[PDB]
Design a protein around this ligand. Sequence first.
Ligand SMILES: Cn1cc(-c2ccccc2)nc1CCc1cccc2nccnc12
Ligand SMILES: [Mg+2]
Ligand SMILES: [Zn+2]
Length: 313
Amino acid sequence: GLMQFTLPVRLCKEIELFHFDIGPFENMWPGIFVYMVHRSCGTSCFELEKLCRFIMSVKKNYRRVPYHNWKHAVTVAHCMYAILQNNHTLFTDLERKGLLIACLCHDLDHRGFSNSYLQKFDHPLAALYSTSTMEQHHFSQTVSILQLEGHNIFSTLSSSEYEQVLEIIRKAIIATDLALYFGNRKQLEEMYQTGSLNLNNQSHRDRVIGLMMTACDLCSVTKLWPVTKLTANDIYAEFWAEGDEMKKLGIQPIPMMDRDKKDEVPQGQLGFYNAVAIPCYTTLTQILPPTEPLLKACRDNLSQWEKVIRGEE
Ligand SMILES: Cn1cc(-c2ccccc2)nc1CCc1cccc2nccnc12
Ligand SMILES: [Mg+2]
Ligand SMILES: [Zn+2]
């Protein structure tokens, strides 16, 4: 009850900033998450024993893959913490509760393979979930862990509040399917520009939370350059292993997943910044002005990839 989590001074200050990196000490990440819940939600949001048990069962259900691992889960939750703390009064009590949990759980039991590889392999999950295959699985794994004995962190909510928080989590996790991002952002662009965007409209709040989820999920592009650049190594280590597995099924992978085309990474990064990342943070900044530092950091990193192409690094 009177038991706050506290961080060393450097972490206490830098965790408030969008570009914070959670460090290489895996044993500090649970404490960092509980710290973020306590400040963004409250010390009363969750029973500490139940929250601690939930966190450790979530950790156990992330795999030892290069990128889609427990460090990614906590990194994506931190970017959501920074958005929530910079937009104090815009979000409901249930949204605060649901969204950090959603971020921690959003890639549960990821195998390091895309939806497209599961469909080509004919994985059983591709028959159970025909679209957003991995994301339906991540939500299914989240409900499983919530139903373990002593893992119900939402136990104090009414039956209808419980259904509402699980619906926030489900939509927030499905929104992390990048295939769905393009259309969501275009609709938000039109709504903002014609002045029809209304944050009391539930279907509009859903779209804005979906964009927050894309923004948090892609947040490696908003870090200091050395973090951005070293995270890109882990991203491609997964993609290139998927490309190898495409070659084993007798399918030429796309260049993004073919280790033989490593030389083209710098130009592939430019495409990605221009087609996905910069548009994401641009629309997010229009809707939520205090998220502008994410956009500024993304533009700084585009400029670094442009230097790499010019042979200036
Ligand atoms: C599009 N695209 C193409 C290529 C490419 C590379 C090599 C040869 C040919 C094409 N790389 C990307 C972006 C990779 C990428 C994908 C998803 C999330 C990412 N989040 C951060 C940084 N990158 C991310
Ligand atoms: Mg994912
Ligand atoms: Zn993710």
